[PDB]
């Protein structure tokens, strides 16, 4: 059978679904998703600035479709995400003149947002990304409007509110690059401190936006172990493997231009060659070997998309590239990596 069956005794296997897919109009994808995945996450439709306009008005069309899709197919559903600094209108935080609103005014908005959104889907969504990406790239607290206005109460209060609204939801903190030394430990320290304040938190989401080479398995392993030691269930939430030339480590002269499209940074428009398919398969295999090793600590592995045509890495960090980050190709056919994942389980040795 599919991935979700192969990995049944280890963890959920999930995918992020965009609004087009979650409409249910695509029979081929409906069939594939039901076969392969037993968890889903909305790619965009539950983000504050997508669900609501700049006047705070709500439009539930896509979010409801997503929840209808998971309900129809009996899929575990992860809400994404209550409190985050991206894809959210500056009007939440600022007067029209640019000045920040008071902490009290912003608290009131958070209360309304969480009570409404988590309330609507209480008991239907099994888990929530309550707060996303609160630690900055510099290892200090991210300098977002949330944080500048509220301090660490923005996190504490978000979890407390979500827990009041749906006491049964598995509440998670989610972030990228927490696979790495530095940001790992900064995140451990932040969560530790909030836990002793009594903040309700059940899970820890490692995004798993990986490169074809970096980070190494050993780093990811340290993170699984460290976050499990906080008494939290570990989830891999946004898995993909970027196979295209990197702009993350370029010379200072290129710091601004590196996000511009250049042909040499987009070398596989005609297809991903077999030798790279091999490397991608081995990279995914390595990763899932690790996950199997620590299956006792891990509740879920969700991929940030189903097939390569829909991946956000086609447009990020450079617009209009042809990337190949996921398990299914642009014709929805399984890639070599998929078969390696299946055989790790098919051929597993037990007594």
Ligand X SMILES: OC[C@@H]1O[C@@H](O[C@@H]2[C@@H](O)[C@H](O[C@@H]3CO[C@H](O)[C@H](O)[C@H]3O)OC[C@H]2O[C@@H]2OC[C@@H](O)[C@H](O)[C@H]2O)[C@H](O)[C@H]1O
Ligand Y SMILES: O[C@@H]1[C@@H](O)[C@H](O[C@@H]2CO[C@@H](O[C@@H]3CO[C@@H](O)[C@H](O)[C@H]3O)[C@H](O)[C@H]2O)OC[C@H]1O
User: Which residues here bind ligand X, judged by CB under 6 A?
Assistant: 18, 43-44, 132, 207, 238, 304, 310, 312, 315
Return the structure tokens found at 98: 């640019």
Nearer to ligand X, 121 or 312 (CB): 312
Nearer to ligand X, 84 or 342 (CB): 84
Contact flag: residue 248 with ligand Y (CB under 6 A):
yes
Contact flag: residue 249 with ligand Y (CB under 6 A):
yes
What span, in angstroms and rounded, lies between the C-alpha atoms of 46 and 62? 8
Query: CA distances (Å), 320 to each of 14, 20, 163, 212, 343, in order?
Result: 26, 19, 40, 19, 34
What span, in angstroms and rounded, lies between the C-alpha atoms of 150 and 19? 32
What span, in angstroms and rounded, lies between the C-alpha atoms of 73 and 38? 9
φ and ψ at 265, to 5 degrees? Answer: -90, 0
Pick one of Mg ion, ligand X, Cl ion, none as the site partner of residue 238 (Cβ within 5 to 8 A by kind).
ligand X
Pick one of Mg ion, ligand X, Cl ion, none as the site partner of residue 312 (Cβ within 5 to 8 A by kind).
ligand X
How buried is 111 (Cβ within 10 angstroms: 0-12 exposed, 13-18 middle, 19+ buried)? middle
Contact flag: residue 277 with ligand Y (CB under 6 A):
no
Least separation in angstroms between residue 205's CB and ligand Y is: 12
Pick one of ligand X, Mg ion, ligand Y, none as the site partner of residue 291 (Cβ within 5 to 8 A by kind).
none
Q: Write the CB contacts of 244 (distance below 8 Å, at least 6 apart in sequence).
A: 265, 266, 267, 268, 313, 318, 321, 323
Contact flag: residue 121 with ligand Y (CB under 6 A):
no
Residues 174-193 that bind ligand Y (CB under 6 A): 176-177
Nearer to ligand X, 44 or 163 (CB): 44
Least separation in angstroms between residue 34's CB and Cl ion is: 20
Sign of the C-alpha dihedral computed for residues 18, 22, 24 and 25 taken in this order: negative
Contact yes or no for 191/200 (Cβ under 8 A): no
Query: CA distances (Å), 121 to each of 115, 118, 300, in order?
Result: 10, 6, 21
Please state whether beta strands 170-175 and 203-206 pair in parallel, antiparallel, or not at all (unpaired).
parallel
What span, in angstroms and rounded, lies between the C-alpha atoms of 326 and 304? 8
**Binding track over 31-60 against Cl ion, x by CB under 5 A:** ------------xx----------------
Pick one of Cl ion, ligand Y, ligand X, none as the site partner of residue 308 (Cβ within 5 to 8 A by kind).
none
Query: First CA to last CA across the chain, in angstroms?
Result: 23
Contact flag: residue 19 with Cl ion (CB under 5 A):
yes
CB closest to Mg ion, residue no:
124
Residues 205-224 that bind ligand Y (CB under 6 A): 209, 211, 214
Pick one of Cl ion, Mg ion, ligand Y, none as the site partner of residue 211 (Cβ within 5 to 8 A by kind).
ligand Y
Nearer to ligand Y, 248 or 349 (CB): 248
- Looking at the DSSP assignment, which residues form a beta bridge with residue 210? 241
**Binding track over 92-131 against Mg ion, x by CB under 5 A:** --------------------------------x-------
CA atoms within 13 A on the CB side of 19: 11
Size of residue set near Cl ion by CB under 5 A: 5
Size of residue set near ligand Y by CB under 6 A: 9
The residue range among 117-125, 154-162, 255-263, 266-274 that interacts with Cl ion, by the rule CB under 5 A, is 266-274
Say whether the peptide bond before residue 81 is cis (omega within 30 degrees of 0).
Answer: yes
What span, in angstroms and rounded, lies between the C-alpha atoms of 85 and 88? 7
Least separation in angstroms between residue 247's CB and Cl ion is: 19
Pick one of Mg ion, ligand X, ligand Y, none as the site partner of residue 18 (Cβ within 5 to 8 A by kind).
ligand X
| Residues at the interface with Mg ion (CB under 5 A) | 124
Residues that bind Cl ion (CB under 5 A): 18-19, 43-44, 273
Binding site for ligand Y (CB under 6 A): 86, 176-177, 209, 211, 214, 246, 248-249
């Amino acid at each position: 059978t599919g991935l979700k069956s192969a990995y049944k005794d280890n963890f959920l296997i999930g995918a992020a679904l965009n609004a087009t897919i979650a409409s249910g109009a695509d029979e081929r994808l409906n069939t594939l998703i039901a076969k392969e995945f037993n968890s889903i996450t909305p790619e965009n439709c539950m983000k504050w600035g997508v669900l609501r306009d700049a006047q705070g008005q709500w439009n539930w069309k896509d979010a409801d479709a997503f929840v209808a899709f998971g309900t129809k197919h009996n899929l575990h559903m992860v809400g994404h995400t209550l409190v985050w600094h991206s894809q959210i209108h500056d009007e939440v935080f600022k007067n029209a003149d640019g000045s920040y609103i008071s902490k009290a005014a912003l608290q009131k908005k958070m209360e309304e947002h969480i009570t409404t959104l988590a309330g609507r889907y209480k008991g239907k969504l099994a888990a929530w990304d309550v707060v996303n990406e609160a630690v900055g790239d510099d290892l200090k607290m991210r300098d977002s409007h949330w944080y500048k206005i509220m301090g660490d109460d923005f996190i504490y209060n978000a979890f407390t509110l979500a827990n009041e609204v749906d006491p049964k939801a598995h509440l998670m903190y989610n972030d990228y690059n927490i696979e790495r030394t530095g940001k790992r430990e900064a995140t451990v320290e932040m969560i530790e401190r909030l836990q002793k304040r009594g903040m309700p938190i059940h899970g820890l989401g490692i995004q798993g936006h990986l490169g074809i080479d970096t980070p190494p398995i050993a780093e990811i392993e340290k993170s699984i172990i460290a976050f499990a030691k906080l008494g939290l269930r570990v989830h891999f939430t946004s898995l993909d493997v970027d196979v295209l030339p990197s702009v993350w480590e370029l010379p200072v002269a290129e710091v601004s231009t590196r996000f511009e499209y250049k042909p040499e940074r987009d070398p596989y428009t005609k297809g991903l060659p077999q030798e790279m398919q091999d490397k991608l398969a081995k990279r995914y295999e390595d990763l899932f070997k690790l996950f199997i090793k620590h299956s006792d600590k891990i509740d879920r592995a969700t991929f940030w998309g189903v097939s390569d045509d829909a991946s956000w890495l086609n447009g990020f960090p450079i617009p209009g590239r042809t990337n190949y980050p996921l398990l299914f190709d642009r014709k929805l056919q399984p890639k070599d990596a998929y078969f390696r994942l299946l055989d790790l389980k098919r051929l597993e040795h037990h007594h």
